Design a protein around this ligand. Structure first.
Ligand SMILES: Nc1nc2c(ncn2[C@@H]2O[C@H](COP(=O)(O)OP(=O)(O)OP(=O)(O)O)[C@@H](O)[C@H]2O)c(=O)[nH]1
Ligand SMILES: [Mg+2]
Lengths: 46, 167
């Protein structure tokens, strides 16, 4: 038994949610610029 | 083509927004649509009152929360597909707040069409035709049920909107 990794796994999870929101913030800020300055980058397919 | 109409598609995660876009612009439900990261758009050229028009149709994940791309996403929109899942009331219950956002982030003559998607999933219906059609009229929306999967009413949804935006 060593039960404390629950607290530690919690810590870990919080850290990755921070990591995730960080990356979503980057993307968003990038996409603003891209949409203003070369929107065709975001076309599909090609 | 000699005019361009900007469309947005909006609605909760997993209603089929990406799959509608993809059914329209490649008549193919390839297939298990895997959730949208940031922002993309397709095009199709249509014809209205004998005039050729490029639809330019933007897709992103169901946000809700304000974000950096939000303003410019709505910004120039001539039409908006507002989409719910026919098998999930929650997605339908949220329509009114989607319409709110839509209405203050686009121009007032922006044409908005309500899509109840996944009409193929009859067995799992969680929302009536009639009550969705009611909401549509109360709110001066165009309304169709559709299926991105079968193709059913997908073309019609985009073209019905295009007429009301004009020749
Ligand atoms: N049976 C059926 N499945 C559908 C239909 N439209 C979409 N799907 C499926 O439902 C799931 C979600 O569809 P998406 O088009 O990704 O929904 P979305 O609204 O783009 O998702 P987000 O990008 O996260 O907002 C996927 O598994 C699709 O394959 C439909 O008309 N019928
Ligand atoms: Mg999507």
């Amino acid at each position: 038994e060593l039960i404390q990794l629950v607290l530690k796994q919690k810590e870990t999870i919080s850290k990755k949610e921070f990591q995730v929101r960080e990356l979503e913030d980057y993307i968003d800020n990038l996409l603003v610029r891209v949409m203003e300055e070369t929107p065709n980058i975001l076309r599909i397919p090609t | 083509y000699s005019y361009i109409f900007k469309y947005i598609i909006i609605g909760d995660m997993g209603v089929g927004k990406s799959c509608l876009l993809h059914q329209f612009t490649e008549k193919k439900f390839m297939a298990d649509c895997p959730h949208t990261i940031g922002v993309e758009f397709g095009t199709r050229i249509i014809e209205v009152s004998g005039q050729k028009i490029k639809l330019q149709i933007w897709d992103t994940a169901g946000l809700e929360r304000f974000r950096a791309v939000t303003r410019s996403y709505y910004r120039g929109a001539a039409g908006a597909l507002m989409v719910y899942d026919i098998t999930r009331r929650s997605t339908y219950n949220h329509l009114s707040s989607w319409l709110t956002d839509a209405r203050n982030l686009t121009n007032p003559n922006t044409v908005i069409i309500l899509i109840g998607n996944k009409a193929d999933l009859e067995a799992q219906r969680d929302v009536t035709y009639e009550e969705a059609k009611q909401f549509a009229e109360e709110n001066g929306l165009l309304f169709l049920e559709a299926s991105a999967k079968t193709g059913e009413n997908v073309e019609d949804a985009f073209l019905e909107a295009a007429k009301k935006i004009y020749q």
